[model samples]
Structure formats: C-alpha cells, structure tokens
Target: WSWESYLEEQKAITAPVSLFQDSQAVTHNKNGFKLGMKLEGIDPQHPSMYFILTVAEVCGYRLRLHFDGYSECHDFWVNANSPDIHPAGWFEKTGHKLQPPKGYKEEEFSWSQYLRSTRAQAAPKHLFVSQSHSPPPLGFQVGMKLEAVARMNPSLVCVASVTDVVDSRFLVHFDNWDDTYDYWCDPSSPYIHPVGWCQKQGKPLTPPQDYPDPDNFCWEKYLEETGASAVPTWAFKVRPPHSFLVNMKLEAVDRRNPALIRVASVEDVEDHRIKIHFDGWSHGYDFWIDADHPDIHPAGWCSKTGHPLQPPLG
Candidate 1:
C-alpha cells in the first residue's frame, strides 16, 4: 500500500501499539531537534559508557543518533525521554566519564577538552520530546518499494525497500545507498512515504546512487517479479514444536539497534516461541522469535564462531 493506503489499512486492522514507552512525555508535539545537532547518548557498540552523539536523523518521537568521531556502525536509536540521552555536556554535569572515539586513548585524549565549543550549537531542550506515542503496527511487506529519508543526507528521501520485517517494526534498505544508509523505523515515521510522495509534496525524489529507477518501476509486482514468496505459517518445518525453554542462554540481534548481536537469554516462552532478553538492556526491548531463526544461536556460539559478545552492563 502507498502512504494513504497504508494508513487506511491500518485503521481497519488496528495494529498493536508502538513498542516505544514514554517516561516523561507531557505533550505529543513534534521534536525541535534538527540534523547535525549534537547530544550525549549511550553507545550501542559500547554500552558501558556515554559518548557524544549527533542528531543524524529525526522522525516522530525518535532520533537516529550517530556517535561522534566513531564509525557509523556505533550509531543507535532512542527517543527524547529515554534516560540514556541528554543535552551536550551531560557527561560533565553527571560526573560520568565519557568515551573517546574508537582507536583513541582515554588517558591522553579527552572529549570535553578537544572540542572547545562543538556542543555549543547542540540541540536545544525544546527539541527533545519527553512524551511520545508509538506508531501503529507493521502493515508493510518485504520487497515493497517506497521512499525513505536518506541517512547520509537527511534532506533527501530516496527510493527504498521493506527488506526485513519483525512484529511491529521493519527494515528499510535504501536503493540509492548500501546498507549503511538503511535503517529500521515505525510506520508513522514522517521520514518515509508512499509512492508519489515527493511529487505530491513538490520535493524531488532521489534515485538510487550510481543507478536510476528500475525499468519496470512497478512497486506492486515486487514478489511477482522476483518469483519469491512467503513461507506459510504451518509450513516452516521448525525443529521441535516446542524448541525454546526459559533461561536458555543464546545470542540474538538486538532489535532496538538491529546491528548489534548481543549475549541473550530466553526470559519467556509462549506457545512454542521464545522471547529474547539482552543481558544489559531492559525488558522493554525484548522480542519473541521462533527457535529456528538464524539469529538465535546456542550458548557460547559467539566465541565459538568468533562473533563478539557484550558482558552484560559493565
């Protein structure tokens, strides 16, 4: 479905509420933060400490934060009310030591001393939205094409796809840029729009980098063109009917910040499915998946396979 079509379909289906929980939301007003605004956030790559983060992308109630001076891989998402995020200089105010960029030493380098007035233009307080609501449920499907805000250039909304789908969230893979520009978002995010959105709004849409629109250009015929189809629910052939057991330790891709695969444990099991809980994060970010999924692995799999693991909240 296109933009309006998706919203209309959502009304009929009444998808589950957004997974985001509000802690200090007093109003539903739009956030005042803009691109390039700096702030402080808990690093997903190294969750043990806070670091300088830039407001790279801002959608409704969510900010795509980029770790200053670190690889883009360290970026993560959080809302204004999240306890983890605060205005610039928060590291000094709270007396919590901040992290230097990757490959830098904490003893010789300094975050506060290096950038004299870098945070001077930090995102204003009004830009943070304490109270916010989650977007509606996931009504989109894989292979469907749409327009999404460019991660490299937030002002640009380029052609994209619904590459992966979870319960209420989905991943948007950019056609113009590689996976680096791709990210997950809610249905109601203003960053994405249905076909013809750019034309309707008088904003020009960008084509995939190093490429142009596909010759066919038919968004509806996605699966038909690829000859791929979804597996029927009863046809999955999962190992055991009840494969997951509570307290079963495993590895899981942290969905809130999809890039990180963390040490995880089975906290709850329901109807033969399992809920994954990160060792350090709270229950709010947990997710339920079938035991057969590839993202799940046996205990010690991270070390055995050379995949890194986080040692809880250090």
Candidate 2:
C-alpha cells in the first residue's frame, strides 16, 4: 500500500527500468500554500468540469484540496505543482463557468462576502511542472495496478488497474467501480501520477480493491492473493472500432438510469469513440464511449425490439 511497495511490485513483475519515467517536475514546499485559500481546480470526477477549490492540507509537495461548503471531513490530493490547480479567476477569464462547491448555498451570505473580499495568492508557478516527457511508449500493460484519482468521487484516490493500452493512452478502470466510472487517459495525465508520488508528496496510499463486492474490500493484499491470472482485462466487450456520424440517433444504456435504454445522439465523434448524450438531458451526462460497445443500438431499437426507452432525466 506504499509507493515503495508499488515500485517493488513493478520490479516483481520484472518490468524494464525504462517502464518508469521520471517527471522533470519539481517538489514543492508546503509553506507556500495556506488552508482556507481559494483556487480554481478541475473536478477529478469530471474533467470538463471546474470548481473553486480550497486548500485543506499542505504536505511538503502534495496539497489536499477541498471544495467550498463541503464538510471539512473529505480531502482530495493534487501535486503541489499539479496543472489542474489554477488562479481563482482563471476560469472566469477563460469563459469557463466556475462551479461552486458541492454543498454550496447562495443563502450562505457570509460565505459569499468572504469569497468576494479576500483575494488569496496562488501557488507559486516556480515549481509548476511545465515540461512533459514523451509518454513511456505504452510500457504500462493491463493488470499493472497503480493509484488513480477516483472518477466517481473526486475527493479520493483509488487503486486502479490498467485495462487496455492503445498507442500512448489507455483506459483506467477504477478498482471497485466498473460500470459507474472508468475512462481513458494517457500515462502523463495529472490525474494519474507516478509510483512513489502520493507518499513522497505526503499523502496516504489507497490500497487495491479485492474484487466485485464490499464485504471483501481488503487492499494491498489482492495482488498476491489473486496473482496475475485472476486479474481481468477491460471487461467491456468492445467490438472492432467503428466510426459513427454526428447526430446518428440511437438507444443506449442511460448511465444514471442503468435499467433504461434512452434515446441518444452521437453528439460528437473522435477517433474511434462517439459522444453519447441522452435525448433532452443536460450535456453534463454526455460521454465518449467506444463506438463498438454493445449498449448502443440503431434508432427505434427500443421499439422494434419491444423494449422501453426511458424519458430523459429532466
């Protein structure tokens, strides 16, 4: 459950030293950040989303961040130099709307005044890791476990196993949550960090998930217990890649409504994936899915096959 343990496992697997790439990024001094200060940060659960974040903890090079109005109980980590953290007004200046913290309430008049009056300083960019290395050439493979920013709950880091690797990018499967959260990102993503990162930055390590249930939520033990053979690859039955034209209507499993197949539009197309959005729901629920996933079906599929297409979550 420790970074050293992580690297040790990598060695146990006999991966090449070249598999690990050193970030030219610098470690930061905790003294530079103060609790209660506001900054702009990406919502890990959803990247296209941004929120006004507050500093919750400062440990040498890792900073624990919190959204305003949320219980002071939850803590999220980002590198002291993570690019996701930006100046408070950076979002507004760039035309991106800022989302207030999860529990934010407009009636919290006192809170609004404080946010308006005090303009705190941002993390000094002196240590910001501006340069990136060419990704380690798909050195990461399926079943190679690593810690990742949890995609469903943004505040925690969870043990994630790589499911598939394509080119320099791959799909990250959050250890416990398969259907609810899992997505693609390259090796160098800020949301994804290197071995020895969480601890060196002063954050506690999250252990690996045991399997498909809550009763067996043991960590750091699963690897040795399951061995490499039990590890599962990306479970989705992704068919051979296919390209879909925009607005090509279809029926897809509504993520929030797992039981219903709702009408959707191919809002966008990229490479081999299509953006699926429920008919009439906010684009917030829209997502990029491998066009080949089995969930998508031709228009009127819900009807011709005699199934129900649920109305949008309006």
TM-score per prediction, in order, is 0.36, 0.35
Q: Residue-wise lDDT of candidate 1 within 54-142, one digit each (tens)?
A: 87776544567887776776566664445456666656654567776555676754545645545436766555431112342345667
Stretches of model 2 off by over 4 angstroms after superposition: 1-18, 24-31, 102-314
Q: State each candidate's clash count.
A: 4, 0
- Residues 1-314, candidate 2: write the lDDT tens digits: 22234335434221122211222122123336677677776666654456767887664444678876667554566555455566655555455556766655534423336566555545444433322222432546667766667645544676677774433445667665643466666544545654445666777656555555544444445666656332232322223334466765556766664446676777888756689987678899989766544456554444444446664445
- Candidate 1: where is the Cα deviation over 4 Å? 1-27, 102-120, 126-314
Best lDDT goes to which candidate? 1
Model 1 poorest ten-residue lDDT run = 13-22
The global C-alpha lDDT for each of the candidates, from Candidate 1 onward, is: 0.56, 0.55
* Candidate 1's TM-score: 0.36
lDDT of 1: 0.56
